Amino acid sequence: ASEAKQTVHTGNTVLLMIKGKPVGRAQSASGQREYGTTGVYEIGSIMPQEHVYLRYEGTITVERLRMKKENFADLGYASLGEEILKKDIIDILVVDNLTKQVIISYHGCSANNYNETWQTNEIVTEEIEFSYLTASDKA
Amino acid sequence: ASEAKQTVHTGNTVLLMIKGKPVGRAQSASGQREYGTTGVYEIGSIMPQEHVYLRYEGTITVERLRMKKENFADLGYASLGEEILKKDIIDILVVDNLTKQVIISYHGCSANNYNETWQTNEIVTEEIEFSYLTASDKA
Amino acid sequence: ASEAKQTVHTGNTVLLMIKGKPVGRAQSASGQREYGTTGVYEIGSIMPQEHVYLRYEGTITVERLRMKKENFADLGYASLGEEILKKDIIDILVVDNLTKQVIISYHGCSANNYNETWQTNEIVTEEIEFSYLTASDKA
Amino acid sequence: ASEAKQTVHTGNTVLLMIKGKPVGRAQSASGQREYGTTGVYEIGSIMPQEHVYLRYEGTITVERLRMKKENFADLGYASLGEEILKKDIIDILVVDNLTKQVIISYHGCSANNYNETWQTNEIVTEEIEFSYLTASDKA
Amino acid sequence: ASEAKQTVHTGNTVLLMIKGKPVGRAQSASGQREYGTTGVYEIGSIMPQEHVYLRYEGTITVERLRMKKENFADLGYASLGEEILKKDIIDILVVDNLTKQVIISYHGCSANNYNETWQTNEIVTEEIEFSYLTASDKA
Amino acid sequence: ASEAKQTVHTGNTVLLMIKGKPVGRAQSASGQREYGTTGVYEIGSIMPQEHVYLRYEGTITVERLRMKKENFADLGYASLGEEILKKDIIDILVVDNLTKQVIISYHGCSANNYNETWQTNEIVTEEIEFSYLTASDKA
Amino acid sequence: PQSDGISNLHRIALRFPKEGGGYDMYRFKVNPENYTIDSPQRTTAIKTKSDIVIEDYGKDIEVINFTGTTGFRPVREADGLKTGKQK
């Protein structure tokens, strides 16, 4: 129940940080990984001998209500047209709200897509599906 | 709470402007922009060492209730048959209601598919999917 | 609200006509189009140079409760077995119920399929998915 | 309202006749007939100039609650193993209840798949999918 | 209504038997068949000349709540790892509960998969998707 | 009714043990084992004459609510980046609560994909998919 | 033997000649992925103006071809701990 005394993370106790700045009105922050694992099959037996890794793959999706200012274009992450080639490796963190202690980092990202929706009597949103090189953490 | 102080964009504070006129009685507009971002892998190391960008796959869909007249085809944006031919490039803007400041803009759209839907009893609905050369904005 | 004074089409104010005759107990009349648009990509830049049309495609689907007489076989549109080769280009219109003024025409069609369902304690239906060459309109 | 005056076909006014007998305790029968209709395109002009017809892909599915005996397999329409072999061509008719006038008929059906389904508590259900040589009718 | 006097099978009046032994706490027993039927098309006509069989296919799926003893591993049907090669053709029946009279038999089976689920505040289950050679019945 | 007399396994009577410790605050564990079983067909006879087994495609998924600390990655089972490298083979057991008798065991698992999911308000959830060399048990 | 439920798999081994006589014993730690064996015949066919003549000279030189991948994870050796790259 109490903040310091629970032992599961609610979305309450997690901040989402990006380019060294907290985000307002973010919604989901799904991080998916595939290590392309596919063990060697081998003629003369039915079963795989050892399971081995064939290609790292890392995707982090962030979804956000569109704020009037400091949207992901204004914060510089997203962009429209050729201008993306001018962009550089963005950087993202997931942090304990109660102590400002990092849970995990994503040490190098780039955008896949920048989906957006306007709809009748509904709140507008940004969506970004970043790809990323590596994830790590300390303390 | 009020329009003059809220932090978020909504369906009621936005106008969709096509060829200098406001679109009437739209229901939703949604835009996907994907860079085809892909990571560059390597023998000997399982993880990719940078991303690169392939093709600017940029699209916007417009869904609208059929105005009794002056719909897209009638007013001269959508087309039928070898009319598609003559319909030169069209421009679209998403506009902030009070000030009509630009939110974002689409230099030069082009139709993909056009769907007019009649059904028992209900209101007639229209769908168009546009692909554009470059999205852009200025403040 | 009033018929002459609204400015959106309800399914109320639309007649569906075919082979110069109105249809009884039709349900949906969905018309979908694809101009196979796929702009030229080009080595040396990320984005498409111009969006260009690669093949027209036109489908109109009509769904109807099966009437005891003057079903789409009796009206001659649909048919069973080889007899289809004897059939000719069917012709379809969408009309203002309040003034008998054409909204759009489909100036040459042929059937793809003639799906049918009988079910327990339910009303029987015809479905037709016509393909068509061109669509046009005047006045 | 009454059977002697209604304009629409319903589940209660139709009988499904197989090999001269009425089917008992069916739930739905649905038939898809697709001509593989395809348009003929052309260099220099983007739109097709006629349609043509490829293959008469004709099918009917029958879904039924399992009669305690005299089901399809028991009575000698469905089959199992190398019984499929011996089961010569079968004929099916859809029949207008009062007069038993023909509605439509299927010259020579042939089984595709047969599914018998048992589940906790509920009634046992059966599914068969038939493909036929030519559908036809006479008034 | 009454057991001897109804003429449809409820899941009540059906036993499921396997390796000459009744099963406790089975749920579904779906049996699906495909005789790969695909009639010969023929240049010079639109429609298939005769519908002909290209490969028998028989699947029977059984789903069961996981019992504390005499699970499908303890009854010997399912197995884990290489040990499957030691297994032999399993045998399955569907029987009248009221008279212990066979409805159908599956005269030679082998496992495809042995799916299992544990979940919070839910009952555990086994699932097996057997493949089988032939099905037959007498009396 | 009671634990000491019930015939069925439930979510409350099972413990999931990884590397000698009980997993805390899991939500579901599900395991698919497929032998790639395939029938051997033959010219002249339409039905297959035996099945054979191809590849032991064996997998278990674990879904869990994120413990405030000592999650999979923190405690040293999941991994990120070139940590996947160093994480040698791991063993998992499914355990009968009272006696801690083995139910089943997985000799040598290996990660496939790892998904950590944050969402508005709600509890953070984690997903891991493991593939193993051989499943096995002893009473 | 193959894995047949009666005996465990036994993997291939190459016995190369050693410079001072005697032999190595290179045994594979993962078995091949493709394995092909050809048995060509020296039979020839010549077509005479009124008959066919079939002539054979016996067995020809066989060909053995196979393809596989060395395992990733370290595996103990009969006199070492050798990795796939060292193998």
Side-chain angles (χ1 to χ4, degrees):
Chain A
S2 328
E3 282 280 68
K5 302 179 183 180
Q6 63 214 344
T7 62
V8 156
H9 287 285
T10 48
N12 132 75
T13 182
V14 174
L15 289 183
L16 191 66
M17 272 174 74
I18 178 168
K19 197 182 174 183
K21 192 80 174 287
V23 189
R25 304 179 179 69
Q27 298 305 310
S28 77
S30 297
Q32 309 168 334
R33 305 179 194 94
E34 294 212 350
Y35 323 105
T37 317
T38 284
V40 175
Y41 304 94
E42 191 201 49
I43 75 188
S45 175
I46 184 160
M47 46 59 70
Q49 298 307 276
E50 51 183 40
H51 280 300
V52 311
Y53 311 103
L54 310 185
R55 52 175 289 276
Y56 198 91
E57 178 164 328
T59 298
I60 178 172
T61 296
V62 179
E63 296 154 19
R64 189 174 181 213
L65 309 186
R66 189 186 197 85
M67 283 174 58
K68 199 168 184 180
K69 289 185 289 184
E70 63 175 344
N71 58 38
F72 288 155
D74 184 14
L75 295 169
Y77 318 141
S79 35
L80 306 173
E82 299 187 74
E83 300 183 34
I84 291 160
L85 276 53
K86 299 181 173 178
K87 298 295 185 178
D88 295 326
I89 299 178
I90 294 146
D91 187 11
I92 290 168
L93 304 90
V94 177
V95 166
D96 291 344
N97 192 25
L98 187 65
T99 70
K100 321 308 181 195
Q101 185 157 344
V102 176
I103 306 177
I104 55 168
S105 294
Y106 298 77
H107 276 175
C109 308
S110 57
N112 294 283
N113 54 45
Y114 181 34
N115 180 36
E116 293 164 322
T117 290
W118 303 250
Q119 186 146 250
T120 293
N121 305 130
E122 280 205 320
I123 295 158
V124 180
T125 52
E126 293 180 304
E127 165 186 10
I128 294 185
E129 182 174 22
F130 291 121
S131 285
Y132 71 93
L133 307 178
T134 68
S136 67
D137 58 288
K138 308 299 152 206
Chain B
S2 293
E3 291 288 321
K5 285 176 185 176
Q6 67 191 338
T7 54
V8 194
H9 281 296
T10 67
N12 74 271
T13 193
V14 174
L15 281 165
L16 178 60
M17 280 181 63
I18 181 168
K19 210 172 184 178
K21 286 77 171 286
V23 180
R25 309 194 181 195
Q27 289 290 49
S28 66
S30 295
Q32 282 199 354
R33 298 175 216 93
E34 320 206 60
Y35 322 114
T37 311
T38 297
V40 175
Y41 304 85
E42 286 186 346
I43 59 177
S45 171
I46 188 155
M47 45 167 60
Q49 298 303 303
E50 68 197 61
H51 308 100
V52 301
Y53 313 100
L54 304 188
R55 311 188 308 216
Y56 206 98
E57 181 168 10
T59 292
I60 179 166
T61 298
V62 181
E63 291 194 20
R64 188 192 174 176
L65 310 178
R66 178 167 183 98
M67 288 275 279
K68 188 176 178 179
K69 288 171 282 185
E70 68 164 33
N71 80 287
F72 301 95
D74 191 48
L75 191 56
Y77 315 131
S79 32
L80 312 172
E82 299 196 344
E83 292 171 0
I84 269 281
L85 173 60
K86 297 174 186 196
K87 305 309 183 189
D88 296 9
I89 290 173
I90 326 175
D91 303 301
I92 290 184
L93 306 90
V94 176
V95 180
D96 185 2
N97 179 44
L98 283 63
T99 64
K100 288 206 178 176
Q101 178 159 265
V102 172
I103 295 180
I104 56 174
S105 300
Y106 302 89
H107 281 48
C109 293
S110 65
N112 301 346
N113 51 61
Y114 180 24
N115 165 7
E116 297 164 319
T117 292
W118 290 259
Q119 190 168 126
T120 322
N121 314 103
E122 295 190 342
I123 290 172
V124 182
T125 66
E126 285 195 37
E127 184 180 37
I128 305 162
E129 190 170 354
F130 275 8
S131 286
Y132 38 83
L133 306 181
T134 56
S136 71
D137 77 287
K138 302 294 157 212
Chain C
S2 328
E3 282 280 68
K5 302 179 183 180
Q6 63 214 344
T7 62
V8 156
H9 287 285
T10 48
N12 132 75
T13 182
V14 174
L15 289 183
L16 191 66
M17 272 174 74
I18 178 168
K19 197 182 174 183
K21 192 80 174 287
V23 189
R25 304 179 179 69
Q27 298 305 310
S28 77
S30 297
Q32 309 168 334
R33 305 179 194 94
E34 294 212 350
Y35 323 105
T37 317
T38 284
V40 175
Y41 304 94
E42 191 201 49
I43 75 188
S45 175
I46 184 160
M47 46 59 70
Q49 298 307 276
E50 51 183 40
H51 280 300
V52 311
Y53 311 103
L54 310 185
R55 52 175 289 276
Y56 198 91
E57 178 164 328
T59 298
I60 178 172
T61 296
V62 179
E63 296 154 19
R64 189 174 181 213
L65 309 186
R66 189 186 197 85
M67 283 174 58
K68 199 168 184 180
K69 289 185 289 184
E70 63 175 344
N71 58 38
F72 288 155
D74 184 14
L75 295 169
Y77 318 141
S79 35
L80 306 173
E82 299 187 74
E83 300 183 34
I84 291 160
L85 276 53
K86 299 181 173 178
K87 298 295 185 178
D88 295 326
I89 299 178
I90 294 146
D91 187 11
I92 290 168
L93 304 90
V94 177
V95 166
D96 291 344
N97 192 25
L98 187 65
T99 70
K100 321 308 181 195
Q101 185 157 344
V102 176
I103 306 177
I104 55 168
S105 294
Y106 298 77
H107 276 175
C109 308
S110 57
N112 294 283
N113 54 45
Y114 181 34
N115 180 36
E116 293 164 322
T117 290
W118 303 250
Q119 186 146 250
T120 293
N121 305 130
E122 280 205 320
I123 295 158
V124 180
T125 52
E126 293 180 304
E127 165 186 10
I128 294 185
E129 182 174 22
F130 291 121
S131 285
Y132 71 93
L133 307 178
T134 68
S136 67
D137 58 288
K138 308 299 152 206
Chain D
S2 293
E3 291 288 321
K5 285 176 185 176
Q6 67 191 338
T7 54
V8 194
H9 281 296
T10 67
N12 74 271
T13 193
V14 174
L15 281 165
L16 178 60
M17 280 181 63
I18 181 168
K19 210 172 184 178
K21 286 77 171 286
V23 180
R25 309 194 181 195
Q27 289 290 49
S28 66
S30 295
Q32 282 199 354
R33 298 175 216 93
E34 320 206 60
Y35 322 114
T37 311
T38 297
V40 175
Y41 304 85
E42 286 186 346
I43 59 177
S45 171
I46 188 155
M47 45 167 60
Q49 298 303 303
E50 68 197 61
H51 308 100
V52 301
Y53 313 100
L54 304 188
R55 311 188 308 216
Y56 206 98
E57 181 168 10
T59 292
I60 179 166
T61 298
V62 181
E63 291 194 20
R64 188 192 174 176
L65 310 178
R66 178 167 183 98
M67 288 275 279
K68 188 176 178 179
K69 288 171 282 185
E70 68 164 33
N71 80 287
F72 301 95
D74 191 48
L75 191 56
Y77 315 131
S79 32
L80 312 172
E82 299 196 344
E83 292 171 0
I84 269 281
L85 173 60
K86 297 174 186 196
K87 305 309 183 189
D88 296 9
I89 290 173
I90 326 175
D91 303 301
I92 290 184
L93 306 90
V94 176
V95 180
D96 185 2
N97 179 44
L98 283 63
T99 64
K100 288 206 178 176
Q101 178 159 265
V102 172
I103 295 180
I104 56 174
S105 300
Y106 302 89
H107 281 48
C109 293
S110 65
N112 301 346
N113 51 61
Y114 180 24
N115 165 7
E116 297 164 319
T117 292
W118 290 259
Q119 190 168 126
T120 322
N121 314 103
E122 295 190 342
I123 290 172
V124 182
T125 66
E126 285 195 37
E127 184 180 37
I128 305 162
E129 190 170 354
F130 275 8
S131 286
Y132 38 83
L133 306 181
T134 56
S136 71
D137 77 287
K138 302 294 157 212
Chain E
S2 328
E3 282 280 68
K5 302 179 183 180
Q6 63 214 344
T7 62
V8 156
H9 287 285
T10 48
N12 132 75
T13 182
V14 174
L15 289 183
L16 191 66
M17 272 175 74
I18 178 168
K19 197 182 174 183
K21 192 80 174 287
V23 189
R25 304 179 179 69
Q27 298 305 310
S28 77
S30 297
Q32 309 168 334
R33 305 179 194 94
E34 294 212 350
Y35 323 105
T37 317
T38 284
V40 175
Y41 304 94
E42 191 201 49
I43 75 188
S45 175
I46 184 160
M47 46 59 70
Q49 298 307 276
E50 51 183 40
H51 280 300
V52 311
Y53 311 103
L54 310 185
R55 52 175 289 276
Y56 198 91
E57 178 164 328
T59 298
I60 178 172
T61 296
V62 179
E63 296 154 19
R64 189 174 181 213
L65 309 186
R66 189 186 197 85
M67 283 174 58
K68 199 168 184 180
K69 289 185 289 184
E70 63 175 344
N71 58 38
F72 288 155
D74 184 14
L75 295 169
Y77 318 141
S79 35
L80 306 173
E82 299 187 74
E83 300 183 34
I84 291 160
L85 276 53
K86 299 181 173 178
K87 298 295 185 178
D88 295 326
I89 299 178
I90 294 146
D91 187 11
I92 290 168
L93 304 90
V94 177
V95 166
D96 291 344
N97 192 25
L98 187 65
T99 70
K100 321 308 181 195
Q101 185 157 344
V102 176
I103 306 177
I104 55 168
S105 294
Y106 298 77
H107 276 175
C109 308
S110 57
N112 294 283
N113 54 45
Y114 181 35
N115 180 36
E116 293 164 322
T117 290
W118 303 250
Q119 186 146 250
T120 293
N121 305 130
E122 280 205 320
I123 295 158
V124 180
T125 52
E126 293 180 304
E127 165 186 10
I128 294 185
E129 182 174 22
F130 291 121
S131 285
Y132 71 93
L133 307 178
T134 68
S136 67
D137 58 288
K138 308 299 152 206
Chain F
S2 293
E3 291 288 321
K5 285 176 185 176
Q6 67 191 338
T7 54
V8 194
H9 281 296
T10 67
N12 74 271
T13 193
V14 174
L15 281 165
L16 178 60
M17 280 181 63
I18 181 168
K19 210 172 184 178
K21 286 77 171 286
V23 180
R25 309 194 181 195
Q27 289 290 49
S28 66
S30 295
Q32 282 199 354
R33 298 175 216 93
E34 320 206 60
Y35 322 114
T37 311
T38 297
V40 175
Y41 304 85
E42 286 186 346
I43 59 177
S45 171
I46 188 155
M47 45 167 60
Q49 298 303 303
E50 68 197 61
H51 308 100
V52 301
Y53 313 100
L54 304 188
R55 311 188 308 216
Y56 206 98
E57 181 168 10
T59 292
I60 179 166
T61 298
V62 181
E63 291 194 20
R64 188 192 174 176
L65 310 178
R66 178 167 183 98
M67 288 275 279
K68 188 176 178 179
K69 288 171 282 185
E70 68 164 33
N71 80 287
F72 301 95
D74 191 48
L75 191 56
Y77 315 131
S79 32
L80 312 172
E82 299 196 344
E83 292 171 0
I84 269 281
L85 173 60
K86 297 174 186 196
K87 305 309 183 189
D88 296 9
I89 290 173
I90 326 175
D91 303 301
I92 290 184
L93 306 90
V94 176
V95 180
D96 185 2
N97 179 44
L98 283 63
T99 64
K100 288 206 178 176
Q101 178 159 265
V102 172
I103 295 180
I104 56 174
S105 300
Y106 302 89
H107 281 48
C109 293
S110 65
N112 301 346
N113 51 61
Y114 180 24
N115 165 7
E116 297 164 319
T117 292
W118 290 259
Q119 190 168 126
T120 322
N121 314 103
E122 295 189 342
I123 290 172
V124 182
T125 66
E126 285 195 37
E127 184 180 37
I128 305 162
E129 190 170 354
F130 275 8
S131 286
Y132 38 83
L133 306 181
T134 56
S136 71
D137 77 287
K138 302 294 157 212
Chain G
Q2 70 190 142
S3 179
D4 57 10
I6 299 178
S7 172
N8 59 82
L9 182 50
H10 188 141
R11 290 191 204 78
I12 297 175
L14 300 183
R15 176 176 196 229
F16 289 87
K18 191 184 296 178
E19 183 181 337
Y23 305 93
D24 188 11
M25 186 61 163
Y26 180 90
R27 64 179 73 81
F28 285 100
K29 250 287 181 191
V30 181
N31 245 30
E33 189 178 41
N34 285 5
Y35 191 172
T36 65
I37 317 189
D38 306 318
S39 294
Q41 201 66 11
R42 297 194 297 191
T43 296
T44 310
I46 57 182
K47 183 272 165 64
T48 57
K49 74 192 290 183
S50 296
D51 218 318
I52 284 274
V53 167
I54 309 304
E55 42 171 350
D56 186 3
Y57 294 90
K59 167 265 202 167
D60 207 325
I61 291 159
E62 299 201 320
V63 189
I64 288 165
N65 193 338
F66 64 96
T67 286
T69 174
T70 58
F72 170 72
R73 264 295 176 166
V75 66
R76 289 203 66 80
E77 185 60 85
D79 201 6
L81 173 56
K82 302 180 77 63
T83 187
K85 183 175 72 63
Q86 284 179 12
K87 199 85 170 179

